[PDB]
Amino acid sequence: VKPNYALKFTLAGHTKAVSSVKFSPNGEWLASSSADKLIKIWGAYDGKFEKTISGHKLGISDVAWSSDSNLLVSASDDKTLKIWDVSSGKCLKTLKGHSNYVFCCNFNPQSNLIVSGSFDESVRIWDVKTGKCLKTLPAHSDPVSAVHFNRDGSLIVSSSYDGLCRIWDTASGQCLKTLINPPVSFVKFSPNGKYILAATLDNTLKLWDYSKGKCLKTYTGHKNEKYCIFANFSVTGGKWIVSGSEDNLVYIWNLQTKEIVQKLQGHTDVVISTACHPTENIIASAALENDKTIKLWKSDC
Ligand SMILES: O=C(O)c1ccc2c(c1)nnn2C1CCCCC1
């Protein structure tokens, strides 16, 4: 059982490296962020360019959607996050408090909170409605590379170049577990909240059992020794792990067997980010400056 992702559209418009692509929860849009200081919105199905959202003073590392698909949050080298109304393109709030680049961001499922991680080694939890910081967690001893809420919002997982992943109780800010030293470049909870997928800068993805603090699966064969490359759980068809790679390919693994099931050829630079559509077997991928495009791919399974 293998997927058959094939290229459907190639999207161009950003003028510097893309950093992150994300499909809206309602499936209608793809958002992209870039070192060019811009967010772009594209039709998720035909790639049609929709709008540019602008206001950050420096490049953007990440963007994330609210559960109702109406809001975006972005994390910027200007040391702020911004909350955006997607329909109007307007900045609703600027979240100030980090003392260096903000690298990662996510809403909780309820979408009343945002979590951020920064070069400043902290994780912050913000109130969406007021735009004020509720908690600053002294989370890591090196830049924070990823932050993600679990399925009900009760926990946050963070990762850092310090080699650690940490699980935090959202309401209290207490660290409930540290997974233990290669730099960790990405982390997220599995859909059921019981596992955690982590990328490290030694060409390795790992699936950890949260309750046991133990690694259950590793996924290798790709190249990842430099860039923050996200990894995804693909769940609409076959159960895969999806990731970009520094050899210009999208890698897709069987989650259970760890075997590579497809390598998507087409980009001409590092595939820095990938995202999986919430209902269709559709992948978005973005590549670095020799390539300059976002590609949309479709599989029958
Ligand atoms: O939906 C999810 O979050 C999810 C999480 C882990 C899953 C899964 C679905 N299907 N199989 N596995 C195994 C991974 C390897 C260890 C035993 C479980």
UniProtKB/Swiss-Prot annotation:
Changing E289A: Strongly reduced affinity for histone H3. No effect on interaction with KMT2A. Changing L207K: Loss of interaction with RBBP5 and reduced ability to stimulate KMT2A methyltransferase activity in association with RBBP5 and ASH2L. GO terms for biological process: gluconeogenesis; negative regulation of transcription by RNA polymerase II; positive regulation of DNA-templated transcription; positive regulation of gluconeogenesis; regulation of cell cycle; regulation of cell division; regulation of DNA-templated transcription; regulation of embryonic development. Changing F230A: Strongly reduced affinity for histone H3. Significant decrease in interaction with KMT2A. Its main location: nucleus. One of its GO terms (molecular function) is histone H3K4me1 reader activity. The record marks D77, F103, F230, E289 as: Important for interaction with histone H3. Keywords: Acetylation, Chromatin regulator, Host-virus interaction, Isopeptide bond, Nucleus, Repeat, Transcription, Transcription regulation, Ubl conjugation, WD repeat. Interacts with PAXBP1; the interaction is direct and links a WDR5-containing histone methyltransferase complex to PAX7 and PAX3. Interacts with HCFC1. Component of the ATAC complex, a complex with histone acetyltransferase activity on histones H3 and H4. Component of the SET1 complex, at least composed of the catalytic subunit (SETD1A or SETD1B), WDR5, WDR82, RBBP5, ASH2L/ASH2, CXXC1/CFP1, HCFC1 and DPY30. Core component of several methyltransferase-containing complexes including MLL1/MLL, MLL2/3 (also named ASCOM complex) and MLL4/WBP7. Belongs to the WD repeat WDR5/wds family. This is WD repeat-containing protein 5. It comes from Homo sapiens (Human). The lineage of its organism: Eukaryota, Metazoa, Chordata, Craniata, Vertebrata. The gene is WDR5.
